[PDB]
Design a protein around this nucleic acid. Sequence first.
DNA 1: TCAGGTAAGCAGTCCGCG
DNA 2: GCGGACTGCTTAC
Length: 903
Amino acid sequence: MKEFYLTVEQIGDSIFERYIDSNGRERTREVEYKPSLFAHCPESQATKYFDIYGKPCTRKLFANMRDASQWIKRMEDIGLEALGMDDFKLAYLSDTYNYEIKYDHTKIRVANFDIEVTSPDGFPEPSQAKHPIDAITHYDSIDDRFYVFDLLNSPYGNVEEWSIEIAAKLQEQGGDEVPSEIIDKIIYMPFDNEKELLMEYLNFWQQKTPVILTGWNVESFAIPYVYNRIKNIFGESTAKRLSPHRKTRVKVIENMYGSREIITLFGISVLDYIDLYKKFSFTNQPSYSLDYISEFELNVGKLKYDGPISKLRESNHQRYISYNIIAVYRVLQIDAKRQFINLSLDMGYYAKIQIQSVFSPIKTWDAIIFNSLKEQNKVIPQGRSHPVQPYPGAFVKEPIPNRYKYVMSFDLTSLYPSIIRQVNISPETIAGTFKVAPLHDYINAVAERPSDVYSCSPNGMMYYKDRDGVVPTEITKVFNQRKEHKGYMLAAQRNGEIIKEALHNPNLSVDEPLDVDYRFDFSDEIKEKIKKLSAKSLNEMLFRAQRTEVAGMTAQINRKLLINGLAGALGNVWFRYYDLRNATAITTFGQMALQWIERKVNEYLNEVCGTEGEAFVLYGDTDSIYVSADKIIDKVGESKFRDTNHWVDFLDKFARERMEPAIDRGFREMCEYMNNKQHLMFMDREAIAGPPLGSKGIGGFWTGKKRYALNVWDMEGTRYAEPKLKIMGLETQKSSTPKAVQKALKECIRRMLQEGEESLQEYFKEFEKEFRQLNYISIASVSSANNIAKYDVGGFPGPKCPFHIRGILTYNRAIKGNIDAPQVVEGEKVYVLPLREGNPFGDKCIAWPSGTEITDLIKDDVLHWMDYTVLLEKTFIKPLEGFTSAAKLDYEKKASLFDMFDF
DNA sequence: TCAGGTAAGCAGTCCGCG
DNA sequence: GCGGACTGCTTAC
Ligand SMILES: Cc1cn([C@H]2C[C@H](O)[C@@H](COP(=O)(O)OP(=O)(O)OP(=O)(O)O)O2)c(=O)[nH]c1=O
Ligand SMILES: [Ca+2]
Ligand SMILES: [Ca+2]
Ligand SMILES: [Ca+2]
Ligand SMILES: [Ca+2]
Ligand SMILES: [Ca+2]
Ligand SMILES: [Ca+2]
């Protein structure tokens, strides 16, 4: 096997590297790496190094890394460009791994741990670390073992040994329901004192030093706590053994509001799973507690316990230890599903970066482009300082607020990256500028053709056409990877729908799930065998189909994130290739393409229906168009269809055979208009929407930009066994809206689109009548809480105080002088509820940490003074009024004349 | 909420709107 | 009441 790196660090004048050697063994080496940088020179000619612009460069080989860094400072003092990779470990990896890296994950030590620390006086601050660490579970992926370190004797209590036998038993037997599949994988180590616990942990850490270190909030809690605790007890040198190079750094993380401190452990890549989840999951949650995310991702219920956590070890150490083990497991289960570690490794090695750099598309692209250019002997430019300037983005059409019965959407494949490729936008393909006409002139094809020589964007920029730029070239590579995984995702989706179909008629027989690859469309053979399976086996298969879909989704959606991130990286001052000319060239081009093809679709459809000037495109956002299809359906007549699937077939055929060709023709013309290098505007049908045939459903509606709902039957080639509501923007999609309210609004929408005005009024009446039985948490609003301090004036709301902040301030007064009550954390999310006037809290609302029950100190009093009426109007009625009005219907039955009986 | 980008919606505060 | 200016927060793309 080829070697691969595990980690890389710069310490003084040494590169420190952990790696896997050609034998498959983990290794560590110190390399006094001498870096090279470059300077412009006259042709000469030496001379094999050229900058991206083609200007000749002399390589300057440095004695050590500090000389190289100091030289960069001198070149700035003098006012001259210091060229080349100034992040010296990237140059190191580039020289040391001059090939496409093939990693073997089973050789990489992925660790995930969680710790427990008991605290009577509130939250155990990692900076202080003044309380004993009384438990650590550390799973090791190489050993496949959960290592449990359990403190028996504490100032906060002396406990008995944990029982694995009691832990395995059901909650109903009195045990802790530790999953049977991990029981045998537990290595349990009890300790008589915390010193002996920490000493073994460090010895253990040394024998099995993590490469990849993860967990839930491990970066913000477990790592800083463990390091500081050890620091307080043994001294800093001992704490520093958490790093295989014995180097650590207190690092300050800045944001908009304040600053926290984390501990950088050199020679380890920390990928905090909460952070992977937030970057890669593409879900906005009301809470990021492990409990909450586990429920959502895995459908496993909350770990129940009586009393507060700060009394749990003392009252139930058995359960304490067991919940610490389950915590670690639940993260592994989430990763088994979402595969974010795999993803991170994939991308990290592809880019040749430190794995933890995957969180930064800027750092990822810097490296991909650097390695690409080094291969051609090209030298990268120096990073400059730029002032942050706003620039324009996409076009969003203003829709006429209305019901819309029949809709087909069309969408451009990977828009921004395709534009980069079509136009050939790169730092070194800039050819010049042309005199620009107002955008509408280019849209309506009446402006002077920008150029006869170069590939153009309507923002004024012209690009070379002889060769592909390094941005287009490299972005094409990641795009192709993305297209493979998306293939798998869509295939697993289709497969999922065939299984769902077969569930309508499950055979009565004891059998097993078929060994199949859900990444590929089911053969006719597999299809028939499925029609013969039991409900149990079909369900087990659906689950696997849905897991294959989620793995494909992660691999595809995040590659899409990386490629789109390049488009935006160009508009980021910290990026080596920041150029607002290039970022605006991408966005302006997109504005044109959309509005150009709106004009084209209108013309085609107006011609084919024999009308003049009617809008067929009702809406569009960034890269998609929504086309009214009422007139196409009405031409062949609604009564001419067998069932819903029949008109869905018909429109599918209309869109694939008549529409897309016309759209392709239109986009080809725009390519030759802008004189682009390559036609890559591919706009395929996405969704086909409408009511169930024979129903009073309205099909879909829009209330404004980014706010609409559609009843979808087919999406990207997936024919739904059950119609799917595609709701964009509306309150059902916002994390700030209550759960109960999301469900209810959704049902109201379902009824409007699938059933009609009457069915809608049935539900609203019933909801309104029962809503006061709903659990207080399921009707709380959620909100992130920033700048509580800013609006805090002596316990009371300052001027302009936000509603949710007032709720927090109210919560603070009610719990004042109590260290044990859960504190609201600045920057996290809170649940919010309105309070009836006259309450003992003395204000109109209260807030408390989301994902939690409100403390028993005030719960009863909160539940009593809860303003239901206000909740109903704000979160539910108002939004519903907005839907019903846009769609031209009523949620309350209005008074007619056909009713007054007997009169 | 350390970690590509812009567009644009809605809740709420404050206050004008004779 | 409702909107406009403004802050704060969230989603669509
Ligand atoms: C979803 C999304 C889109 N965009 C921009 C860039 C996209 O090219 C453009 C269109 O978005 P999308 O239509 O959502 O996706 P896409 O065209 O990039 O890729 P595909 O349709 O094949 O899945 O909007 C972002 O900048 N960030 C995002 O998170
Ligand atoms: Ca815990
Ligand atoms: Ca698209
Ligand atoms: Ca798409
Ligand atoms: Ca059957
Ligand atoms: Ca789209
Ligand atoms: Ca097509």
